[PDB]
Write a protein that binds this ligand. Structure first.
Ligand SMILES: CCCCC/C=C\C/C=C\CCCCCCCC(=O)O
Length: 132
């Protein structure tokens, strides 16, 4: 049911990522480098366990999770969060909670592109990935 999200994806557009990073308290030097980084995201499944890798020249992450089951996560910017990833209206919705704060990372497929919408506070970032 998540199968169309599976594969290797490369960043091809980014809007308002600096705003999103600023909202999370990311320092200017990290924002600078991140603004010029194009990650590759790899989404794999093995039964109902998904693994989502984000690789780049700057930072790398990897999470594994079951849909609908909370997991601990330590984000690229070193937040220690409680996370859950579900399918909602055909979109893969990742919610992170820490210290009463929350952020959503929503992935949807539009015309074969994967669109990642990041929301924290008032900041809304839209990043577009294309399939490799
Ligand atoms: C792991 C790759 C990180 C690339 C940016 C570099 C540093 C991290 C700074 C802020 C992290 C915010 C959460 C990371 C969001 C990655 C978004 C994406 O998946 O496009």
């Amino acid at each position: 049911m998540v199968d169309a999200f599976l594969g290797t994806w490369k960043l091809v557009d980014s809007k308002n990522f600096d705003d999103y990073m600023k909202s999370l308290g990311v320092g200017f030097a990290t924002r600078q480098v991140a603004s010029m980084t194009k990650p590759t995201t790899i989404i794999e499944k093995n039964g109902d366990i998904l693994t989502l890798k984000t690789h780049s020249t700057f930072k790398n992450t990897e999470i594994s999770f079951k849909l609908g089951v909370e997991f601990d996560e330590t984000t690229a910017d070193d937040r220690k969060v409680k996370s859950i990833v579900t399918l909602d209206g055909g979109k893969l919705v990742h919610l992170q909670k820490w210290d009463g704060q929350e952020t959503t990372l929503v992935r949807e497929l539009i015309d074969g592109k994967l669109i990642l919408t990041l929301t924290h506070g008032t900041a809304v970032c839209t990043r577009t990935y294309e399939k490799e």
